[PDB]
Write a protein that binds this ligand. Structure first.
Ligand SMILES: Cc1cc2c(C(N)=O)cccc2n1-c1nc2c(c(NCc3ccccc3)n1)COCC2
Ligand SMILES: Cc1cc2c(C(N)=O)cccc2n1-c1nc2c(c(NCc3ccccc3)n1)COCC2
Ligand SMILES: Nc1ncnc2c1ncn2[C@@H]1O[C@H](COP(=O)(O)OP(=O)(O)OP(O)(O)=S)[C@@H](O)[C@H]1O
Ligand SMILES: Nc1ncnc2c1ncn2[C@@H]1O[C@H](COP(=O)(O)OP(=O)(O)OP(O)(O)=S)[C@@H](O)[C@H]1O
Ligand SMILES: Nc1ncnc2c1ncn2[C@@H]1O[C@H](COP(=O)(O)OP(=O)(O)OP(O)(O)=S)[C@@H](O)[C@H]1O
Ligand SMILES: [Mg+2]
Ligand SMILES: [Mg+2]
Ligand SMILES: [Mg+2]
Lengths: 728, 539, 189
């Protein structure tokens, strides 16, 4: 079957035309590390690239970059043929000319700054008709060759001279611009993208394959996420990088026109897609299209709801068409549209975490060349609630600040701007510092999905509960073969209890990251401020996010807050039950035992919580968190000052040697006080900057006890005798 | 299966014999209303029964009526009825009705109540004439205009619930019959871990499982061609990991409500408690399986049984054990779910939870942990007055309207039978009081032989020996002992990898870490209410 | 004083240099939302910054849209946007907005959400093309359609509060400069 066909897939390297492969393919085609490879495609065109070696990769696939994807007119899901070409080529003469469609506002010499750094340390061959995109000067411009030396025999070498003429050529219709969104222009959402890659290109690249098989292809896909997540960008990318027709109707142009033709426009927008199959349909906002809820105002607006329901209900197989819609909140879609066959498959895209937010900076600042002292690592660590739109706006205004910082003194009043100053500009430290100190981070905060970074060596002590948490989390995650041969069934819930300030949230995070699962933190008061009075209607949707993001470990920090509001200290005349507690304890029982969702509860006063959630089958295992021991006390000190220049004169074990009856809050506040006094004398000496032994010595004497003594024995009297409280 | 045969009793009988009904005085059916959660099959069965009879079938779902301009929507519905008259016999089916006639607190829009009045006119005037039947489907009971549920328009209703495991077994093959399966694959175990799936859910699950199998070979084969050959279609077969990975995804995420299942626990399956097995049959089994009795001697059978005693005694299972041997279905109503559906000052969802047990005759209804309602009104100390509620009075009044000859049986369960109102304990709602004592030896040995039925337990251990030490432990303790033993055995099984059977020492460690679920003082509290309980009635 | 300079940072920079923004990748401002209690000066500053730059300025406050008959109100707003495109650079200012888009618990009237959808359409489609900026003013925060506060339409907001004593000092003379005052009179106390 000619075992040379490879499946096209996007590349992960952020560079020029370099294609990565695997190890068996390396020796199968007898090609060396640095060699000239030959690629063949359709439409009778030739393209060249360089094969890169990779080992930490997938089983069998090629890594096809977007720079030559447009050159060979090959999209995602197609086939690519590769073959070696050990032909010695040498470059002597190359001629390139830009196009007058995107060179506006650029003057001066553009060959000594955009072509010199791009050619050195590259040795990338070129072909006739190659469309390669370069970067520089706050923009990207592509080149095209019209006449040069006979192809191939083109290798980048320093002995090649160049000479400009000053007459651009008109762009033809054979190629397309690379300024549009591609599959490599989206970052931050990695898990959410691949499963779209599993349901969009599979039923599109093989239309006749689905006609013979009985598998029903997708029809409706519903999007989620807070505004600015990228509900439009990803849809445009997946609709434009497949070759199928794409038609856009957002929401308001339907309701903006007069009554009577709005329905006709929607009706014709569906029949226009049928004839030119395959096609795709995308809807930008849907919450303002079908508000069939307590609103129910206006006669004509439920008309279009019924029209769209009619136009989707009648969609039999026939052609290969898929409709997609996006929204901002779960309680904004007509329940009649979420039925089977219209919207049964949903994806939740949350706020990216720090490592998710890292790529968003460069995917928009790639045309912004950065200096040596600047890095995007530290700047994406102090924020925790930013989405792609927020970062794009932040970088745009930071660049505007840099522009004005030189326009205030340079005072260059001219129509066109020269490139001799565009390249010299570079953003500095103070720009990114001043960008975040402004009002642009002011946004909406909700449940964020992040991955912890604390492992076994990162913490210490508590060998009696580290030994046990793994027994009920790690093995029935990493050992699928077990837990059914012996019968039985894994647990779902763990309740944490003990003295306040023992670091229960961190202890819960420490186990979730080692099982390759995400983490959502639900602290007490935030689930209380979202309660309002006699109306919440926002519980059912906070559990599905932990289900789509499998594996996931859910955590309830300080569950005791709900009991606080119903009755505390003395309490009411009856039990401390609530309509928000019964609805969650009933919801957690509907799930099957084979799901990998794990819910973890935390409390500080485990005598007032109802045994209803402590029933044998919701919260079975009870785990006690004792006071930190020596091994953990030394570790907390080595952890809370990891970014401070502490001198070696101090002793880490010595502090834990005196500190015996202190909790994590006390251990932290001691270091806080020591640093606070050291930072004052550091400034006072200005009228050397290191922490000495006396700095910790003063903090030693001002130590207090977070917890008393009587509550301690109260806590370890519930530890040995706890099963007696179940049922009574 | 039950819902289909009674449609087979009211559709093909008045259709295959048109002239037979013209001579007799029996009025044929006209309107049939469907129920069930979305995806149950309200359209599939209607299409089957309309296409496999030879009569004409016309389809109008709901939205095409409201999608067109005002004025012709009513004309389309009017002509859809006259077109069916000429080509008799014919049938009419309506897919969704909740969005057609919302004559309730909504009452928005002038033109939309117009079509409601139009359909009411077109059904009110339907005399005999020809042989035509209209049918409609919906998703919830509180979505139909009450004016349409009158006699002559919609008086006969069928409730189709979520299929149980044996109900869900056939749905897999009726869609995977064209999918030939390998030798190591079976659909039995895969339809046992789920309890809330309908036909649409299973169809979507199987479709995506097949897509996973397709991609598992398209990722490495890389066959780019227009037409596909049959030499590889036959070789493809779904495997174990596909059905495993299918359910671990987000497709089981659906809506959960009252499910109608049949229990699988009988007399030999349990043991002990000969003093209450002897008695439950006397008040359930005979006035079910012996229709000839209970009227020759006069009297009347009971309707309600209240279960009480120490928590964790297995009251739900004891109630299920009697319901399956009388050839009746079972609906489980646990405490907190009837509390989360209460909200505040507005529930309006009680009257419809009793009819499902009536259409599914015979049926045994169970209230698990009825004490939850008293929890919310007043617990421990209690309020200044009685622990009565507007959700308790409405159910105790509803259970009195039923005739004594219905086979519906309601069973209550509680754990603190001193704070419940005697209002439901009145002589005529909850007459018989039955006490569940601590499990004896015969039941203690049985629970252990039951909770490890799927584990490779070695023969070195002794089942009777464990029950010999265990005397003052309840069902929760007996279960958690085995849970701990299995949990420690499964850890050493993995630790030895750096043989897989449960040994005697594994149970021995679990023996020492045993606790007591219940105390002692509450026990004598429970068996002091057993002998003297009629004194609490009325005061 | 503080509120003015940061407008001076986002209005005249992307207007006095139209071709500079065409070459660089920095996206210029499009929508600016104003705040402050009524009488703060939401119109005066907008008129000043629209008339002292040389670019075209077009004024539509709010009520003339809802005062006319149904059908042509949307056409007037649609033409008010295309008239600004041809004579670039131009600027658009809206005096009151709370009475234009009340897409909240009110939701009364069919034609009034029509103009909300029309303005959303006319702003959503605003790609770069020319150099145009729309600005709107209001009196309270809980009066703007949340669909308009999204990124790309209204993401940058300025709050102008009640001036303090030293802030109120200059307001006296900027209106009494033509009123010559005697010797014993001062505006300080
Ligand atoms: C800033 C910090 C504050 C804090 C507090 C507190 N009352 O503020 C309590 C417990 C841990 C705390 N940490 C903390 N944070 C971290 C670590 C760590 N050490 C291990 C540990 C944690 C909880 C338990 C035992 C031992 N401790 C480990 O590295 C990542 C973050
Ligand atoms: C898993 C299981 C848990 C459990 C519990 C519990 N506190 O978790 C209590 C009572 C029975 C229980 N079962 C249980 N489940 C079953 C059976 C059975 N044995 C007979 C019996 C039941 C209740 C009573 C006497 C004796 N026991 C019988 O086979 C079917 C299921
Ligand atoms: N995940 C992302 N990665 C990269 N850029 C993004 C991302 N999300 C948004 N952007 C940028 O933000 C711009 C505007 O995106 P939007 O379509 O407004 O976001 P949205 O999630 O669709 O919410 P709306 O459409 O504003 S309601 C895009 O053109 C991108 O430049
Ligand atoms: N009970 C069932 N047995 C077999 N297949 C079923 C069953 N119910 C649904 N299906 C399948 O699911 C498909 C869609 O059924 P639906 O008509 O959508 O279900 P529904 O109960 O009518 O609820 P709606 O119409 O979606 S609101 C059918 O074409 C069948 O293939
Ligand atoms: N900050 C200010 N400085 C100087 N004069 C001002 C100021 N604010 C208002 N005025 C004067 O008040 C007059 C009316 O201003 P308005 O436009 O009515 O104020 P506003 O903040 O726009 O609130 P409205 O438009 O009345 S709802 C202006 O023509 C000025 O003469
Ligand atoms: Mg968008
Ligand atoms: Mg249907
Ligand atoms: Mg004004």
């Amino acid at each position: 079957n000619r075992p040379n066909r490879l499946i096209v897939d996007e590349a992960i390297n952020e560079d020029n035309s370099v294609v990565s492969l695997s190890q068996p393919k390396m020796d199968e085609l007898q090609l060396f590390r640095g060699d000239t490879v030959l690629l063949k495609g359709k439409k009778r065109r030739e393209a060249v690239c360089i094969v890169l070696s990779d080992d930490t990769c997938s089983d069998e696939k090629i890594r096809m970059n977007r720079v030559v994807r447009n050159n060979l007119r090959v999209r995602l899901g197609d086939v690519i043929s590769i073959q070696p070409c050990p032909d010695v080529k040498y470059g002597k003469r190359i001629h390139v000319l830009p196009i007058d469609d995107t060179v506006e506002g650029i003057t001066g010499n553009l060959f000594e700054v955009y072509l010199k750094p791009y050619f050195l340390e590259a040795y990338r061959p070129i072909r006739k008709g190659d469309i390669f995109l370069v970067r520089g000067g706050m923009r990207a411009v592509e080149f095209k060759v019209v006449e040069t030396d006979p192809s191939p025999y083109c290798i980048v070498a320093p002995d090649t001279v160049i000479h400009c003429e000053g007459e651009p050529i008109k762009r033809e219709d054979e190629e397309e611009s690379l300024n549009e969104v591609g599959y490599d222009d989206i970052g931050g959402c990695r898990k959410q993208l691949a499963q779209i890659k599993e349901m969009v290109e599979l039923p599109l690249r093989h239309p006749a394959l689905f006609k013979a098989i009985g598998v029903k292809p997708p029809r409706g896909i519903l999007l989620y996420g807070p505004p600015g997540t990228g509900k439009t960008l990803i849809a445009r990318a997946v609709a434009n990088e497949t070759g199928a027709f794409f038609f856009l109707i957002n929401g308001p142009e339907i309701m903006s026109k007069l009554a009577g033709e709005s329905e006709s426009n929607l009706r014709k927008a569906f029949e226009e897609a049928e004839k030119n199959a395959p096609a795709i349909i995308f809807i930008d906002e849907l919450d303002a299209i079908a508000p069939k809820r307590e609103k129910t105002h206006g006669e004509v607006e439920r008309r279009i709801v019924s029209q769209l329901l009619t136009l989707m209900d009648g969609l039999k197989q026939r052609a290969h068409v898929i409709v997609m819609a996006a929204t901002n909140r779960p309680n904004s879609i007509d329940p009649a549209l979420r039925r089977f066959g219209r919207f049964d498959r949903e994806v939740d895209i949350g706020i990216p975490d720090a490592t998710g937010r890292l790529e968003i900076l460069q995917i928009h600042t790639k045309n912004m060349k950065l200096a040596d002292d600047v890095d995007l690592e530290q700047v994406a660590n102090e924020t925790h609630g930013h989405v792609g739109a927020d970062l794009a706006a932040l970088c745009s205004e930071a660049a505007l600040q840099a522009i004005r910082k030189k326009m205030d003194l340079i005072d260059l009043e001219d129509e066109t701007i020269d490139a001799e100053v565009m390249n010299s500009l570079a953003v500095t430290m103070d720009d990114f510092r001043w960008a975040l100190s402004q009002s642009n981070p002011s946004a909406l905060r909700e449940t964020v999905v992040e991955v912890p970074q604390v492992t076994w060596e990162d913490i210490g002590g508590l060998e009696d509960v580290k030994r046990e948490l793994q027994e009920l989390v790690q093995y029935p995650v990493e050992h699928p073969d077990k837990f059914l041969k012996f019968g039985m069934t894994p647990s779902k819930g763990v309740l944490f209890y003990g003295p306040p300030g023992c670091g229960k949230t961190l202890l819960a995070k420490a186990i979730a990251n080692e099982c390759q699962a995400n983490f959502i933190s639900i602290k007490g008061p935030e689930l209380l401020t979202m309660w309002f009075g006699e109306s919440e209607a926002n519980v059912r949707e906070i559990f599905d996010k932990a289900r789509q993001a499998a594996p996931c470990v859910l955590f309830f920090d300080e569950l005791d807050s709900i009991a606080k509001a119903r009755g505390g200290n003395i309490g009411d005349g009856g039990g401390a039950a609530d309509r928000v507690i019964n609805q969650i304890l009933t919801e957690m029982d509907g799930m099957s035992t084979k799901k990998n969702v794990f819910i973890i509860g935390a409390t500080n006063r485990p005598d007032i919580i109802d045994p209803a959630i402590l029933r044998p089958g919701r919260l079975d295992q009870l785990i006690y968190i004792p006071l930190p021991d020596e091994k953990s006390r030394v570790a907390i000190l080595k952890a809370n000052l990891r970014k401070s220049p502490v001198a070696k004169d101090v002793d880490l074990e010595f502090l834990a040697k005196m500190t015996n009856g202190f909790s994590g809050a006390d251990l932290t506040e001691i270091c806080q006080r020591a640093c606070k006094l050291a930072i004052r004398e550091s400034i006072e000496s200005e009228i050397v900057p290191e922490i000495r032994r006396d700095h910790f010595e003063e903090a030693m004497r001002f130590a207090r006890r977070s917890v008393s003594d009587n509550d301690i024995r109260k806590y370890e009297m519930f530890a040995q005798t706890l099963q007696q409280s179940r049922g009574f």
